[PDB]
């Protein structure tokens, strides 16, 4: 738990960005939002300067499979 610096994690930031306000709120293995790499692109850019990603496609790579663990799909 840290609320001082460093953007949020992929899933969380994903739920906020691609997860809209909260079409789910208590999701699990379903889908509530779908975006192309354009969103997971900018999204990873925010958590880029703080995430252990390895590059743009690399951040979205983990950020993508990450969104699937919540309720947001991603199209390459």
UniProtKB/Swiss-Prot annotation:
GO terms for cellular component: cytosolic large ribosomal subunit; ribonucleoprotein complex. It comes from the Bacteria. GO terms for molecular function: large ribosomal subunit rRNA binding; rRNA binding; structural constituent of ribosome. One or more lysine residues are methylated. GO terms for biological process: translation. The keyword Ribosomal protein applies. Keywords: Methylation, Ribonucleoprotein, Ribosomal protein, RNA-binding, rRNA-binding. Part of the ribosomal stalk of the 50S ribosomal subunit. Interacts with L10 and the large rRNA to form the base of the stalk. L10 forms an elongated spine to which 2 L12 dimers bind in a sequential fashion forming a pentameric L10(L12)2(L12)2 complex. Belongs to the universal ribosomal protein uL11 family. Forms part of the ribosomal stalk which helps the ribosome interact with GTP-bound translation factors. This is Large ribosomal subunit protein uL11. It comes from Geobacillus stearothermophilus (Bacillus stearothermophilus). The gene is rplK.
């Amino acid at each position: 738990m840290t609320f001082i610096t460093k953007t949020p994690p992929a899933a969380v930031l994903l739920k906020k960005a691609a997860g809209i306000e909260s079409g789910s709120g208590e999701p699990n293995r379903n889908k509530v939002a779908t975006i192309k790499r354009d969103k997971v692109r900018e999204i990873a850019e925010l958590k880029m300067p703080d995430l252990n990603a390895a590059s743009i496609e690399a951040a979205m790579r983990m950020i993508e499979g990450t969104a699937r663990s919540m309720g947001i799909v991603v199209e390459d």
